[PDB]
Amino acid sequence: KSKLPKPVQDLIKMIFGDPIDVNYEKLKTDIKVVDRDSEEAEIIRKYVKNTHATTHNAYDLEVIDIFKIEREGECQRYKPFKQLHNRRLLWHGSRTTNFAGILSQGLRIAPPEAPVTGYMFGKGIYFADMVSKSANYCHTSQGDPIGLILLGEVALGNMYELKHASHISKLPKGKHSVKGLGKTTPDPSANISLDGVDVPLGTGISSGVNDTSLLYNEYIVYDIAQVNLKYLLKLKFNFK
Numbered sequence: 001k002s003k004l005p006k007p008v009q010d011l012i013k014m015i016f017g018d019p020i021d022v023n024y025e026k027l028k029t030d031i032k033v034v035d036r037d038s039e040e041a042e043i044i045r046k047y048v049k050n051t052h053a054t055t056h057n058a059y060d061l062e063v064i065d066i067f068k069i070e071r072e073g074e075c076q077r078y079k080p081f082k083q084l085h086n087r088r089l090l091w092h093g094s095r096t097t098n099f100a101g102i103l104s105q106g107l108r109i110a111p112p113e114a115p116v117t118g119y120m121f122g123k124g125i126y127f128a129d130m131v132s133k134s135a136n137y138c139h140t141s142q143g144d145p146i147g148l149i150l151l152g153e154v155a156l157g158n159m160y161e162l163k164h165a166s167h168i169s170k171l172p173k174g175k176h177s178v179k180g181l182g183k184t185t186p187d188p189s190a191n192i193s194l195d196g197v198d199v200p201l202g203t204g205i206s207s208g209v210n211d212t213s214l215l216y217n218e219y220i221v222y223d224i225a226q227v228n229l230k231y232l233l234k235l236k237f238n239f240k
């Protein structure tokens with residue numbers, strides 16, 4: 001029987017759908033329950049509450065469990081980007097069935113033989129600052145209403161800021177990432193700092209960006225090493 005805390009056991013059962021502890025080791029990821037009443041937990045629940053987009057009104061989100069995560073060696077891997085400026089705690093949603101691969105291998109760029117459909121800026125690693133924009137990629141339903149979402153520390157550095165789809169072959173010199181400029185943005189004045197990482201948990205305001213394809217921001221890096229996965233949330237989707 002398992003010596004993991006019950007919430008981590010339930011995460012494992014959800015991810016693998018072998019014994020629980022053997023399946024834990026296959027993730028090559030240190031997993032800790034964040035306490036409900038911790039400051040970390042308050043900040044993350046505030047990020048969820050404030051960055052639910054008005055146009056994503058099919059469901060509300062409740063945070064069941066928050067996990068602090070540490071992929072084996074992802075530290076050493078993140079070293080070259082560790083002190084790059086403009087490091088941001090951003091959402092990445094994916095189907096539950098993907099999380100064993102995501103924790104064991106990290107987030108990866110789609111292979112050349114996958115469609116570029118859905119990628120406004122070409123194959124890369126995509127993040128949102130709006131929880132619901134990322135939560136939509138969990139593909140939960142009323143009959144499967146529990147999903148998994150990541151918070152990554154993303155080393156954005158100098159952002160190549162774009163308003164329309166463009167499959168860039170190469171970042172301009174001195175740029176580290178792409179930011180797709182949305183009509184709606186977390187209020188920059190409400191940004192807070194968690195462990196030297198910027199958290200844009202401000203409620204959505206008009207960006208005052210005109211002539212843009214995007215309702216909401218998105219952030220893209222083309223190097224797997226610019227991502228340090230920090231948290232994994234188990235979300236209840238309440239469908240209306």
Ligand SMILES: NC(=O)c1cccc2c(O)c(Cc3ccc(C(=O)N4CCN(c5nc6ccccc6[nH]5)CC4)cc3)oc12
Nearest residue numbers: 091092093098101102117118119120126127128134137218
């Ligand atoms: N995701 C965001 O939070 C997110 C945040 C902000 C903006 C965007 C934006 O435009 C996208 C694009 C997107 C997502 C998904 C897919 C898609 O169909 N797949 C990619 C993931 N696959 C996959 N199977 C896996 C199995 C094991 C291990 C890893 C695996 N990975 C399935 C195919 C296409 C485009 O996403 C955005």
Ligand SMILES: [Cl-]
Nearest residue numbers: 133136137138
């Ligand atoms: Cl979607």
Ligand SMILES: [Cl-]
Nearest residue numbers: 169170171222
């Ligand atoms: Cl590129």
